[PDB]
Design a protein around this ligand. Structure first.
Ligand SMILES: Cc1cc2nc3c(=O)[nH]c(=O)nc-3n(C[C@H](O)[C@H](O)[C@H](O)COP(=O)(O)O)c2cc1C
Ligand SMILES: NC(=O)c1cccnc1
Length: 397
């Protein structure tokens, strides 16, 4: 059904529907499909879904000139631990990704692979099954008591990364990025947000290291910036974006309660702008908003009201994608896209609205999403959400 009580506003007259160049791509509008884990990849081997994924992405690519960022995609076995999330390190994975990107490109839209590593958010027993470490910044701190107990029970305690482990992660990012581009992707997004591995190095709650990868702002940023530099060099800065969540508390990150947190993210952005002024500007920075500190909470819950991402605009001078509870708040979008280099990511309501862009353009009702099929191995709740005209036929109006 449609979302009850939602009063839609047409956004056709705004910068949301002005073209913009992002890296090598030419967008027709600024409504972005952000990375959304859906768990339809098959086991063993973390292989993209051969039946439904190309259809799902093709559906959401249907407006020409749409930017699509894929679900988090593991860069290597050691970076993973979720059986039904895809990877892009292997030939078998690449083979299906080719079909998925083909479906997106057939719509004259664009595909960016989000490159993912889990760190302490992984499942230590699943890793142990595969002979893999349970990786983190500092084994002195665990993400929560459940995982700590699981780690003990699996005889796979947290492993503080060594410098050599970090070098291997960088090699994995490079390999996964080369595979992404060879498979046909228009670019990659480095996931350094939402409490996964890179974010764990950025955050002073998870990172208690005293080597060159922790203990200062500069040190905590080093791993993320080494990944950024490795990908700039191998696939070009215009094929690389970076995702950050300054105010996130998901997966036990500090968020705004850490008064040093904006200096940490300011440093990262300044380092990116320094690179840009030297001729190597990333295609974009993707920020999760304090509107959503935790995406497991329903829209309107978990909103941090004591800080904003405004600081980023004074530092970084390229495109910024903003995500978090924007679908239900066109009035907020209307104000924020007045800035001419701002794009808007719509997550949960892109799940439920394959024709979201049209609905935004025309001010139409939105399909309610069904959380119970976010992660199920089904076409149901994946490819069977109706377009507006289809919903009207089913009587949803
Ligand atoms: C089911 C689900 C899966 C998600 N998967 C990813 C992911 O793989 N990588 C990522 O960076 N963010 C992921 N997110 C976070 C979203 O990209 C987005 O930041 C968040 O949902 C807030 O935007 P929204 O209110 O428009 O949904 C996911 C969110 C949901 C609800
Ligand atoms: N916010 C995220 O990065 C994320 C990733 C996978 C599942 N849920 C949330």
């Amino acid at each position: 059904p449609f979302v009850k009580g939602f009063e839609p506003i047409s956004l056709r007259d705004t910068n949301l529907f002005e073209p913009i160049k992002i890296g090598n791509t030419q967008l027709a509008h600024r409504a972005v499909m952000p990375p959304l884990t859906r768990m339809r990849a098959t086991h063993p081997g973390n292989i993209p879904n051969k039946e439904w994924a190309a259809v799902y992405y093709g559906q959401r690519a249907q407006r020409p000139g749409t930017m699509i960022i894929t679900e988090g995609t593991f860069i290597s076995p050691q970076a993973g631990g979720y059986d039904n999330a895809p990877g892009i390190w292997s030939d078998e994975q690449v083979a299906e990704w080719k079909n998925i990107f083909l479906a997106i490109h057939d719509c004259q839209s664009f595909a960016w692979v989000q490159l993912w590593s889990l760190g302490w958010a992984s499942f230590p027993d699943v890793l142990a099954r595969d002979g893999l470490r349970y990786d983190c910044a500092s084994d002195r701190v665990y993400m929560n008591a459940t995982l700590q107990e699981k780690a003990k029970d699996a005889n796979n305690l947290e492993h503080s990364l060594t410098k050599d482990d970090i070098k291997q992660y960088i090699k994995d990012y490079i390999h996964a990025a080369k595979n992404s581009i060879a498979a046909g992707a228009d670019g990659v997004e480095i996931h350094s947000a939402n409490g996964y591995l890179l974010n764990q190095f950025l955050d002073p709650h998870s990172n208690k290291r005293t080597d060159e990868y922790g203990g200062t702002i500069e040190n905590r940023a080093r791993f993320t910036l080494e990944v950024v530099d490795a990908l700039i060099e191998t696939i070009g800065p215009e094929r690389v974006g970076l995702r950050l969540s300054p105010y996130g508390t998901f997966n036990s990150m500090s968020g705004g309660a850490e008064p040093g947190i904006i200096a940490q993210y300011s440093y990262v952005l300044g380092e990116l702008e320094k690179r840009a002024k030297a001729g190597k500007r990333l295609a974009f920075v993707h920020l999760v908003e304090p509107r959503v500190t935790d995406p497991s909470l329903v829209e309107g819950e978990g909103e941090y009201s004591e800080g904003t991402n405004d600081f980023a605009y004074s530092i970084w001078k390229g495109p910024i994608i903003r995500a978090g509870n924007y679908a239900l708040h066109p009035e907020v979008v209307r104000e924020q896209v007045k800035d001419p280099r701002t794009l808007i990511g719509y997550g949960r309501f892109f799940i439920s609205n394959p024709d979201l862009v049209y609905r935004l353009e025309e001010g139409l009702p939105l399909n309610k999403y069904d959380r119970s099929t976010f992660y199920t191995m089904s076409a149901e709740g994946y490819t069977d959400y109706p377009t507006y005209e289809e919903a009207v036929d089913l009587g949803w109006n």
